[PDB]
Copies of this chain bind each other. A is one copy, B any other.
Amino acid sequence: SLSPVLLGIVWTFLSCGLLLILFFLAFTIHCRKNRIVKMSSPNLNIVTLLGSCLTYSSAYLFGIQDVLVGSSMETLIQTRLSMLCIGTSLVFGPILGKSWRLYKVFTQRIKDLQLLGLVAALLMADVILLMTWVLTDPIQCLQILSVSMTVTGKDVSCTSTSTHFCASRYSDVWIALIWGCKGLLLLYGAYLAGLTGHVSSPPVNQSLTIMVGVNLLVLAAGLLFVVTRYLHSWPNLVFGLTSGGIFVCTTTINCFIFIPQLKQWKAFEEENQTIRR
């Protein structure tokens, strides 16, 4: 039911995003010891890159229907949603860790190990929620055909609907849990971004990135929740909107992190070349 043109355009856009991610990864691994790259925590950026590539992979997974090879659509939905959750956690953990380190250094002066441990605790919370969701009730797909008589007290209407969807029995409770924990994380991240407001340059100050990212995350998540809930008879629209939202959010966050590093690196190297001659 998915048009080949939409699939091709979405695949090309996600591939370009993945190539940008790989370019940033190569830049931050090769130029680790440089001052501009080193002062921006190159080790904590690797986790953000991995989260971004995981999110792009989930966006790829959102575009396939039916089965892979006689497989279960339930497993596909579960794995792509859990991949998206883990990817967003890994994207947003390191940024908050960097902001917290900047705040603590500014105020009565933290190694990378403690920040990685906090990020690991965040990931453990997400993993616990995903595991209890999967074990308590899977996302089993059901064929619902039924006839219902509606009585509003003034008129009677009968409808016959044959609906098929893949969902949990109590899906809104897991939605509330995941969205709520993420939202508490985003509230504390906005607090941290405000605390480190105008404290350093954008390469070291990850405060505009947080404020752009949280707003994009909330907007995209709300739009896609509503669209998936109601416009389920529009597979092309749902697929395009989901992939576009994931791509836009991930690419915007990564660009906001890494464009300052690249331009400052270029300026520093050009200044060194001018001085040497």
Contact = CB atoms under 8 A, between A and B. Distances in A.
Contacts of A188: 190
A186 interface: yes
A173 B226 contact: yes
A110 interface: no
A190 B194 contact: yes
A143 interface: yes
Interface in A236-263: none
A76 to B, nearest CB: 15
Interface in A179-210: 179-180, 183-184, 186-188, 190-197
Contacts of A225: 172, 176
A229 B172 contact: yes
A184 B221 CA distance: 12
A215 interface: yes
A146 B158 CA distance: 9
B142 A152 contact: yes
A170 interface: yes
Contacts of A141: 152-153
A218 B187 contact: yes
A145 B148 contact: yes
Give the oligomeric copy count: 2
Contact of A215 (B184, B192, B219): B184
A230 B172 CA distance: 9
A159 B184 CA distance: 39
Nearest to A159: B146
Contacts of A151: 142-145
A150 interface: yes
Contacts of A41: none
A141 B153 CA distance: 8
A161 B139 CA distance: 22
A97 B130 CA distance: 39
Contact of A230 (B170, B179, B194, B222): B170
Nearest to A175: B226
A143 B150 contact: yes
19 contacts: A140-B152, A141-B153, A143-B152, A144-B148, A144-B149, A145-B148, A146-B147, A146-B149, A176-B223, A176-B225, A180-B222, A184-B215, A187-B187, A187-B190, A187-B214, A190-B190, A190-B194, A191-B193, A191-B194
Given A143-B152, A147-B147, A176-B225, 10 more contacts: A141-B152, A143-B150, A145-B148, A145-B149, A172-B225, A187-B218, A190-B190, A190-B194, A191-B193, A195-B197
